[PDB]
Every structure is written in structure tokens, then in C-alpha cells.
Paper text:
The [name] (Copper Metabolism Murr1 (Mouse U2af1-rs1 region 1) Domain) proteins are highly conserved in metazoans and unicellular protozoa. There are ten family members that play key roles in intracellular trafficking and in the regulation of transcription. A hallmark of the [name] family members is a highly conserved C-terminal sequence of ~70–80 amino acids called the COMM domain, which has no known structure. The N-terminal domain of these proteins, which we refer to as the HN (helical N-terminal) domain, is more variable in sequence across the ten proteins, and is proposed to ascribe unique functions to the different family members.
We next determined the structure of the [name] N-terminal domain by X-ray crystallography to a resolution of 1.55 Å using multi-wavelength anomalous dispersion. Overall, the [name] N-terminal domain has a globular architecture and is composed of a six-helix bundle with a meander topology. We therefore refer to this domain as the HN (Helical N-terminal) domain. The overall structure of the HN domain has a similar all α-helical fold to the equivalent domain of Commd1, which was previously determined by NMR. In [name] the α4 helix forms a central core element that extends the length of the HN domain. However, the topology of the five shared α-helices (α2-α6) is similar overall. The electrostatic surface of the [name] HN domain reveals the presence of two basic patches and a negatively charged region, but it is not clear yet what their functional significance might be. Mapping sequence conservation of the [name] HN domain across species shows conserved surface residues mainly in the α1 helix region.
Author numbering: -3 to 115
Amino acid sequence: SGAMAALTAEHFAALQSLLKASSKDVVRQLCQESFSSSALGLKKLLDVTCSSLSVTQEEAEELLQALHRMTRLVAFRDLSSAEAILALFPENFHQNLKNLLTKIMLEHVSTWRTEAQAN
């Protein structure tokens, strides 16, 4: 329990793998797929994640778990301002990656919150 209370050190470490992405669009799509997927269904995204980011299977799994948690937390708590989302992050997390993730959360939170709160 408390899954929605915080992202863990392992989550934040895993999200840093997104700096290997070849474009911002890859990050966007990984956020959307990780949200829509159940945690137990994230294994279905491993091959495309490994192949797109050139990461290990373990890096991909940890990343996908982190994105799944972050996007669900944003939806569950209705974190719908940059202020609210920025509050999740450590000071020692890459600033422009954080800003990108915040941007992407804001692009989807209204739809995500509706989808999640319906279920």
C-alpha cells in the first residue's frame, strides 16, 4: 500500500533511462502506453522499450514500472498543474527530463483522471 504516496528512489533512478530516448515523442508514447497498461501487462512493452532506448531488459522493466506508477499517481491525485507534479521530484533529478515529464503529464492528466476515476 501507499503506492500513490511517493515514487521511490528506484523509480526515479529508472526514469533517468529516458535520457537515452532518440526523441521526445518516444518518451510521450512510453508514458501513454505505461498508463494504459496494467502493471502485470508491462512485460508486453519490454521488447519495443529495449529496442527503442537501447537499454537492458531490467532497465526497461524498471522504467516501465516507474512510468506506470507516475502516470497513475498523477491521475489518481489529479496533479493538474506544473506545481503539483514538480512536487513529486527530488532536487537531484535531471531538470530538463523532469520538465519534459511534467509537460507530458499535463498533456494527458484530464483524460487520464477521467479514465482512472471511472474505474
